[PDB]
């Protein structure tokens, strides 16, 4: 936390120390996760060099978790929301474990909420256009068998269809069945689909989301 980016010449060995004492189910993960968060805040952009070595363990935490209420999964999810644009080349083997977390009907409800919210918040720095079919269907499955995860799943869906332009117009009749079956009203999803079906402009539809994020950051 004190040396921001000068820890690089001694960072690799640090990872070598974390891969040795990160056993699966003990009280040592609660501090390893905080160490990961602090390393992420320190490196800030160069973390992608040392992210792969910590990817297996994370996966073994997502499936082999026997914590009361799945609180280690929640801490790991809150630690993942800090990665930002670092998990750009590694979103392919780290997203499926999270999409498998909120569509499982036996997982605790707060863990599913945490997964939905981290998927919702990870779209403010990443391009989620390619991984559209892997997210649209688990969400419409979470919407018809979970009467309490409706609002958070709708927020995630609205944040996802904001990046997709007219590329989402093919899914509208598929989601509308579930939306009218349970009388699901969301005010931002209605806005987005109204601007998708009926045109708003021509330059605003089918736009790179990173371009929009950059032009709104300035």
């Amino acid at each position: 936390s004190f040396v921001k980016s000068h820890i690089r010449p001694y960072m690799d060995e640090i990872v070598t120390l974390m891969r040795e004492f990160w056993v699966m189910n003990t009280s040592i993960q609660s501090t390893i996760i905080l160490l990961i968060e602090q390393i992420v805040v320190a490196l800030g952009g160069e973390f992608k060099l040392y992210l792969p070595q910590l990817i297996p363990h994370m996966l073994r935490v997502f499936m082999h978790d026997n914590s009361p209420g799945r609180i280690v999964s929640i801490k790991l999810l809150a630690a993942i929301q800090l990665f930002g644009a670092n998990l750009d080349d590694y979103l392919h083997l780290l997203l499926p474990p999270i999409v498998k977390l909120f569509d499982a009907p036996e997982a605790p409800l707060p863990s599913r909420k945490a997964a939905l919210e981290t998927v919702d918040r990870l779209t403010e720095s990443l391009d989620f256009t390619d991984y559209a079919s892997r997210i649209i269907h688990p969400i419409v499955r979470t919407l018809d068998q979970s009467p309490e995860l409706r609002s958070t799943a709708m927020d995630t869906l609205s944040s996802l269809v904001f990046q997709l332009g007219k590329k989402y117009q093919i899914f509208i009749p598929m989601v509308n069945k579930v939306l009218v079956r349970h009388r699901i009203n969301h005010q931002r999803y209605d806005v987005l689909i109204c601007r998708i079906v009926k045109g708003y402009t021509l330059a605003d539809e089918e736009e790179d989301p990173l371009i929009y994020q950059h032009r709104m950051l300035r």
């Binding site: 060099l49 080349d89 005010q187 209605d190 708003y200 021509l202 371009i211 950059h214 032009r215």
Partner: protein, 479 residues
Amino acid sequence: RADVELERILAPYTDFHYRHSPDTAEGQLKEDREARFLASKMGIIATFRSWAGIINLCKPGNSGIQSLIGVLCIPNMEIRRGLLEVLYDIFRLPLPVVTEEFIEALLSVDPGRFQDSWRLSDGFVAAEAKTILPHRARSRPDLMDNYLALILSAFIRNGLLEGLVEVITNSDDHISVRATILLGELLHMANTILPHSHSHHLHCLPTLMNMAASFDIPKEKRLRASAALNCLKRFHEMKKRGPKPYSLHLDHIIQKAIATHQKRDQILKDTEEALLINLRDSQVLQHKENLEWNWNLIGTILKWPNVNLRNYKDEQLHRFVRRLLYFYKPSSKLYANLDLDFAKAKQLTVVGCQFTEFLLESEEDGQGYLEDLVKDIVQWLNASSGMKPERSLQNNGLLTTLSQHYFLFIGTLSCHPHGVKMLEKCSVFQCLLNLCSLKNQDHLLKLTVSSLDYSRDGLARVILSKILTAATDACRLYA
């Protein structure tokens, strides 16, 4: 002589410590270097436009084009950043901005970026349509493509792509972004102007993919190679997107043309509950303070399929419509006073257009409001054109405020068949016929010639013909 006379002009780049004059003032040593760089660039990009220079610089021997690529593969951040400008202006490509992030320099090379020629005073719509809309020729030779293909083949033969990859990986970020953009532009030009045999193995990029997939090299090179591949894919997506209408008149023109082409050859209900909820959260009826309304909700309550003031006879909806009408009227001096470059200026215009079309969607219940709005617009236009003796000069407000978008409302109103009837009920077409005659205001003719619709025969073509035959020479030229 063979290899010592003509190849001198590229000595400032190939020689890292180049001294042109034996005795020069020691005070000016960097300005002299920049002048040498500029002159050598102007000579190098001038020998590649002639055949006697192309052939003599790309000879199969120890030519002067291989010495130009070889010094590009040397980590010298002064020669390497100056050779990229020569490569950029050799292929007639636009230069990106000097940044370190790819997503900011990719936006500066957008074929549809705003230009100074597209302003109302300069080139309002005709100059803008030239850039974004493509030429009508699909089989003309276009000798420029021939020349560019020859130059690109000559450069690829001597190993330019490998040098660009080496510049992309082993260099700074300021130069990595510019080399990635140049590589993307060259890869796009390849699959467009090169024959299939010349460009069927270029998209593999072996030297970059073998680096992005090798786990023996240091991890920094692998990660920057993967990032370069991702940026190349992003550039390809940007290229296959296309240029989009920057302005709001050309947008409506293209949309109307596409709609005509679609309809020449062949959703939620929200009965009473969701309509009222969306009308409530919009905040229009809670308070009448403008600029604090929720304009997204207004747009979606105006654009929803079956909400047309003709099947939902609710007093709250009529209050909503009357408040929006009083806001949009120019006499109220509420919308017509906001200046251009406003924070939310395009959205207000889009909402106004879809609102004056929603009023038209009710052919039996939307007269009292639409007639009032268009009559107020005609009043404002006759006052600002010079048909009154008060001032007869109001160009200081039309050119700098959102009151110039009242031509877009008449434009989106003249497309529909029931729209032109309402437009003729009031003295709109006669007003434009009278406006065509004046000589002092030329911007109003630009505005009225690029807003109306000429799809069907009627009074809309008579105004166009009157401007084309009897008008000011500059207005006639723009028409």
